[PDB]
Amino acid sequence: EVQLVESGGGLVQPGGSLRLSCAASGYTFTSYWLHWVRQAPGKGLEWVGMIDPSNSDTRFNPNFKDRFTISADTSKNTAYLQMNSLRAEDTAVYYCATYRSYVTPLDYWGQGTLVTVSSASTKGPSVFPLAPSSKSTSGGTAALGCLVKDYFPEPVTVSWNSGALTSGVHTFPAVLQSSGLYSLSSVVTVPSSSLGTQTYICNVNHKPSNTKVDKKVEPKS
Amino acid sequence: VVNGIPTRTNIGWMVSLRYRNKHICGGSLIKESWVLTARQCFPSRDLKDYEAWLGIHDVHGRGDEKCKQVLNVSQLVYGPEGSDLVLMKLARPAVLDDFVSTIDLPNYGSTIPEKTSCSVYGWGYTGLINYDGLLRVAHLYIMGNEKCSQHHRGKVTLNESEICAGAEKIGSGPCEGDYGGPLVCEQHKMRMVLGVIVPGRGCAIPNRPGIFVRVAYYAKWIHKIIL
Amino acid sequence: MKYQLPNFTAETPIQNVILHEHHIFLGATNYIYVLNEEDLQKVAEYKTGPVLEHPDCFPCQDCSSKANLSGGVWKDNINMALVVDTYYDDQLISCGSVNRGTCQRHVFPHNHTADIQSEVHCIFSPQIEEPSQCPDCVVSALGAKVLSSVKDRFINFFVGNTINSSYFPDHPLHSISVRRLKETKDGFMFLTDQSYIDVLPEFRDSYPIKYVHAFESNNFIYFLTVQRETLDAQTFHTRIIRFCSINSGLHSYMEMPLECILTKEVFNILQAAYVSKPGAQLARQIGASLNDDILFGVFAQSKPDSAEPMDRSAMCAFPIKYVNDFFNKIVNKNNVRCLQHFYGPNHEHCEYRTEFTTALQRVDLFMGQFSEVLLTSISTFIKGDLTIANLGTSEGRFMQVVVSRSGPSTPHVNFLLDSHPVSPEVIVEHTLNNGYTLVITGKKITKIPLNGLGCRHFQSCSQCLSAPPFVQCGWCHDKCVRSEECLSGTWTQQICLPA
Amino acid sequence: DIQMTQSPSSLSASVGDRVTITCKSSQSLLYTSSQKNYLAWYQQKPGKAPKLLIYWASTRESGVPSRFSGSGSGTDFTLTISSLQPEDFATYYCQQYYAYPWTFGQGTKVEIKRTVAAPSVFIFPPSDEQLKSGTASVVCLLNNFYPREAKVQWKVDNALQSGNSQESVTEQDSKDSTYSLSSTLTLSKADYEKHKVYACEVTHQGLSSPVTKSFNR
Ligand SMILES: *[C@@H]1O[C@H](CO)[C@@H](O)[C@H](O)[C@H]1NC(C)=O
């Protein structure tokens, strides 16, 4: 199986530079051009460029011909996208990709890393409980969750009971507040009968601020 | 102009474009400060090399003294891609005269009826042993782009940016030295420059009409530039 | 492999070939032959020489009148260029070694497009001014490359000339230049003083420049040269020359060295070049748009301190886009300097004509398969998703081989065309349905099918069925051919009926 | 570039319907030698790489359900999806890989129509822990409703609120074809401790009349 993993994503000042990694496995690295594609949050797909590991040839979307660079290390089966003079509109998800043969465009992709070009400081979020209602219909359904508030930048991830609860979960799109700080809640619906018996922990992770939080949400006094 | 006649007098709107002190092309004075002409007439990007001569009958100015105007060029504004047009701005507006005069433009997008009388003017090649150097004129008639191409043997088909004119059965028309000058026609009492002379597929071939750039197609563009 | 194909042997050696209106025109010593496209039978011939040339006798007239031999020298007329024009009334334009390198135009009569004798005009106007210029002196006898193109409603000639210093106040030729035909058709014109870039008189003898090939692409004009690495260098290399396609003059003129290597064995001397689109598979392999022009060039190793080919060959591909990226973005100053042979070495300057210092490198695409051989000709075409090259050798050997970075390929077609070296002047024609190339060897020219020849090799149904699958060979009732050539309804890759 | 123009940008169709997306390119993607069009169709689920559906204009990729079909030639191409399923909610991208730079269409957002379904509404008071901070967040949950158009109005001691709240909506659910919504009221601790009743008032096509959920500080 072909596998592609990006790395190096994160926060970077406007004007600054950032090097993305793409480590490949499962094929002759030198026999396929390695492509980079990007997507701004909720926007279309834009093709960046590609390199040929065998000789280090490059091809760029005329837009990035000046500012962008692609490098390769055959010994590491890894490609590097190098960006400079980064600006606001470069904030995006960056995928690396390749193909099975000349018949297809891109057959394989990475997960993508998020590159945020901003001037804001990294801030870890606070995590507050969204405690289930006293009057949760007994025999019926209760709602509870987590307020993940005031962090930067994206993204944050929410699992419940360490991935063991997934049914009935809605982790919402984070919103950008006026302070320029992100905030989101994650809720889950649950049998009312389960309250006081079943432990509900939301597992929150913000890798940029390097903070993990497990908040147990329970009925209040 | 091959198989043309000398013009009996001056033609007010005729411009001789000089490159490195020699006549290189024709042009039409369409406004005090604007001459219309062809892209092929500019070998050099450096405007010091160019002069416009107005109110001249003889290409060397011989005999033209109290009428001739010599102006520098301050701007070249090229027509849209595929037009071969250039609008040349004079460093100093030309003074209108009996000898110096503008020629009207057509309405944008206007058509012209087939057997409409027209005239080409120019100081270019004539095939004469001793060209006197007096401005020449040849009379042509308009021809449908379709019918023009039927005479051209389907070797070339015409875009709407082109226009055709030619002598009925004889060979005559503009040639080397005539480029950028006007094809002029009058349906009504007024003269309009309907076409601009551009290099053709051979000078003065019998039964073979000339292709000109259709001014009425670029009329809108021209007006933005000159008003 | 032995095949019988449509062929033609001329009275003399063939220099150039041009295909127009289903007739084939041959530029040969002392003759222009007109052949039929179908069977290559001679339709007509035009005697261009020998001619009697002299100081007094003047260009574009016969001085056979006064063959008095006062100082008469007979000279064979070698064709240096042969061009078809259909912008003005259809014409053949032919320029020979004699008569100051002037050209002659053969105007086809309305219904007879194989008649080059009725109307023949010698292109010459006496230099009008007080001039040391000869716009009508087009072609050099030492070797010339003519690229013809219509631009701005004029016919423009871009010309590469090899020159010496045996020259006149009139009758100076130019190394590289652009000039246009007058609409009167009686002469050529240089538009400005920048319309030509010449080797300094001081170097014309010690610094020969050979012009292998020329082409347009991307709005640029490209010439390929062979020459010394340096003014006084004893070594030779290949360069690609780029300039703006304008007629007013040569602009943005830049020369760049081209190394074709094998993995560090340098093949420094280009023998022949062909530009075409890449087949689908190859395009992906080399990062090209199916859209993109590719320069395919067969290179050879020179003998030490020489431009003489050494019988070892490589084939490198140069995407124009790739080439352009190096021309376009200068990078290190250290790689660029004033054009050494145009300005002096010690010029104040040392528009601005420029040369690069380091060579742009590619890697043999045939993986050293042609190391012990001298490739002298190459054309290139697409078949399905494949890219195929037509190669010729110094020995008269012709080969068809698939081009790919993924593995080498034994030519599916390989046979001896002739005793004589295969000429680099080739033609590819795509009859939509199917296609052929015209290949020259000495005095003979041959019409080779682009596709079905692999099959014709097999003499029997059995052999034919055990042909390698990619050739798409099959048995049509009495012969081995590809599907498309079977007029007996029934074509097979599976069944041989009783013999 | 070669410009890619998808149409429409959005459409909302029912389960079992035939959907049609259109893709026009500024020049022919036809590779004449093999007579193949170099145009492809991707499907993109939120937070996921694009998945290749169709290549060479009409050739379905391995695995791809039979109901996806490409067609067209030259400059005009069509992605059809007969028998639309709920898991088919996504954004479809046409891409040409005929020349560089490769270019995609704007993408077409595809949503699933389904019977109207009223939301369950819940309300959350700020947490005491959060009040230690100095701010109060009041959360209102709108669970599993269709269609998306929903109005939430906050009320404190019965007064309407303006520009002190924000909402996010989840991506349609791949099997329910529903959305969920979250509305946060943000207030200073001062302004919060100064009032008594906090209500969230929802209007939806699924509710006979508006629904209110509230609590007392
Ligand atoms: C050349 O053509 C002649 C005339 O048909 C033919 O008989 C002969 O075999 C051909 N020669 C070769 C080498 O194909």
Coordinates of C-alpha atoms in Angstrom, one line a residue, chain C residues 47 134 150 153 186 188 200 222 259-260 271 285 340 352 376 410 429 431 440 458 469:
Chain C
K47 CA 18.4 22.3 -63.3
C134 CA 23.4 42.4 -48.6
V150 CA 4.9 34.5 -41.0
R153 CA 1.8 39.8 -42.2
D186 CA 12.0 41.4 -55.2
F188 CA 14.8 41.0 -48.4
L200 CA 33.8 39.6 -34.9
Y222 CA 15.7 28.6 -31.1
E259 CA 25.5 18.7 -22.0
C260 CA 24.0 15.3 -22.8
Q271 CA 24.2 15.5 -34.6
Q285 CA 7.6 10.4 -16.9
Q340 CA 32.2 36.4 -26.2
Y352 CA 23.0 43.1 -24.6
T376 CA 23.1 10.9 -37.5
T410 CA 15.3 -2.9 -28.3
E429 CA 4.0 13.4 -42.3
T431 CA -1.6 11.2 -43.1
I440 CA 17.7 10.5 -47.0
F458 CA 7.5 -11.7 -40.2
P469 CA 2.3 -8.0 -28.4

